[PDB]
């Protein structure tokens, strides 16, 4: 029910290219359109990729980047996802030319927490929640993509910015982790794609953070919607909140601006 048939893709173009492998746009049995992820070789812990890969395919939500299947029969392995139009979230950020409003900007945020509500409702952590792991369509809804994928990549790199002071200190990952790294998203989120702690090292970042020290209000963020992602950074990690409470606070604001 996981495995996809190869020899149903058709390859139209290579959106990209990295250590990771590359992804190309394709179609699916003539029609449907798909992202084909072919990954580099030696690069991921495959058998347990695929092992996990089946418990993906029943995570369904309208703002999780879908898992269509993977191709395990020949190398390189396949990932066959959802397509995305406007690719990284990141990147759509950092194009000046879209002239965002911030209403825009608070859609993203409730696309990103929606999803990962969804994720948290059914206890599955994404470990990597970042801008760069989030996709955008051609409707301009953004979608939570590889969720839950580094726990399978063999390997400086460890995204130390979007990390609490308890998973830079003890390696503690939880529920907490990933709201902490949904914060900074909507930092950069409202920073058109600013590196959080621009100025500042990876080491600089996490003695910031231990010292509890923090990112500060973005200009195109209010008062309550810079309040909403510093509630993310709390030190004790269960006086952070839920994704369902910031859900809750995200709509509010909505209502509110
Ligand atoms: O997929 C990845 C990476 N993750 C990865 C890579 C290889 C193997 C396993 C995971 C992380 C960021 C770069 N990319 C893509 C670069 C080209 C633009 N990308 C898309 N554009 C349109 N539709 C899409 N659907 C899924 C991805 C995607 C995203």
Not at 49 to 74: D, P, R, W
Not at 151 to 169: A, G, I, T
């Amino acid at each position: 029910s996981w495995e996809i048939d190869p020899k149903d893709l058709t390859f139209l173009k290579e959106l990209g290219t990295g250590q990771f492998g590359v992804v190309k746009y394709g179609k699916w049995r003539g029609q449907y359109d798909v992202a084909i992820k072919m990954i580099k070789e030696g690069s991921m812990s495959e058998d347990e990729f695929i092992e996990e890969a089946k418990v993906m395919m029943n995570l369904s939500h309208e703002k999780l980047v879908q898992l269509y299947g993977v191709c395990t029969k020949q190398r390189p392995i396949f990932i066959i996802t959802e397509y995305m139009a406007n690719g990284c979230l990141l990147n759509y950020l950092r194009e000046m030319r879209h002239r965002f409003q911030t209403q825009q900007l608070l859609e993203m945020c409730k696309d990103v927490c929606e999803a990962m509500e969804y994720l948290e409702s059914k206890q599955f952590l994404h470990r990597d929640l970042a801008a760069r792991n989030c996709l955008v369509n051609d409707q301009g809804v953004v979608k939570v993509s590889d969720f839950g994928l580094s726990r399978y990549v063999l390997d400086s790199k460890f995204p130390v910015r979007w990390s609490p002071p308890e998973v830079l200190m003890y390696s503690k990952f939880s529920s907490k982790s990933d709201i902490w790294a949904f914060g900074v998203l909507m930092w950069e989120i409202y920073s058109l794609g600013k590196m959080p702690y621009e100025r500042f090292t990876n080491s600089e970042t996490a003695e910031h953070i231990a010292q509890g020290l923090r990112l500060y209000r973005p200009h195109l963020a209010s008062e309550k919607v810079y309040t909403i992602m510093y509630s993310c950074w709390h030190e004790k990690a269960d006086e952070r909140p839920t994704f369902k409470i910031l859900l809750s606070n995200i709509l509010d604001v909505m209502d509110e601006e």
